[PDB]
Amino acid sequence: TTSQKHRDFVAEPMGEKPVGSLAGIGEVLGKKLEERGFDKAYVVLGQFLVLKKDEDLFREWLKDTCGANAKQSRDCFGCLREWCDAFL
DNA sequence: GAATTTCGCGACACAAGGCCTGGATGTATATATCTGACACGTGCCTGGAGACTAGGGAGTAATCCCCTTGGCGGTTAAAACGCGGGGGACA
Numbered sequence: 001t002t003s004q005k006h007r008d009f010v011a012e013p014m015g016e017k018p019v020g021s022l023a024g025i026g027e028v029l030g031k032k033l034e035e036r037g038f039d040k041a042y043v044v045l046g047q048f049l050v051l052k053k054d055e056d057l058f059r060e061w062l063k064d065t066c067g068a069n070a071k072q073s074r075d076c077f078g079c080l081r082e083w084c085d086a087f088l
Numbered sequence: 089g090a091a092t093t094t095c096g097c098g099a100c101a102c103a104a105g106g107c108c109t110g111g112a113t114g115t116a117t118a119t120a121t122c123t124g125a126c127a128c129g130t131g132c133c134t135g136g137a138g139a140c141t142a143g144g145g146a147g148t149a150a151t152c153c154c155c156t157t158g159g160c161g162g163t164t165a166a167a168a169c170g171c172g173g174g175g176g177a178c179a
Contacts, residue, residue: 003149003150003151004150004151005149005150005151023149024149025149026148026149026150027148027149028147028148028149029148029149068148069147069148071148071149072148072149075149
């Protein structure tokens with residue numbers, strides 16, 4: 001149900017992880033996000049938080065920023081929500 | 089010492105290179121002619137454009153592992169260098 005990258009991100013605090021470490025964000029989407037500005041994982045975390053942890057809003061924002069499809073956005077949102085529940 | 093004579097000198101001659109000049113030739117140019125091949129105009133009709141749908145190809149992440157890179161220590165096989173010379177390039 002969960003990719004290994006998902007668990008690896010969830011287990012420990014993000015600290016200074018690159019945006020490419022998020023579940024559902026690979027090389028291409030990572031590079032697009034870095035161009036768009038969100039060049040650190042905690043930056044995407046903050047963008048998640050500002051949207052009040054909402055699901056649909058965050059998924060639409062991710063699709064509109066880097067162009068990810070349903071699955072990649074869903075994985076990123078799920079990993080971020082679990083990380084918030086585990087450390088926030 | 090005088091006269092006759094052989095070697096050299098100057099005038100005549102000849103020969104060769106370089107330059108001055110003109111003609112024959114071909115080349116580029118102005119004028120004039122004209123034709124047939126390029127340019128434009130029209131009918132139509134066949135091919136390109138537009139709207140819509142289904143589905144498969146491709147994009148993108150996740151993951152494994154292999155194989156490419158880098159490093160080390162010896163061990164020589166091969167490269168560098170100099171030197172004499174003779175055969176090959178060049179005129």
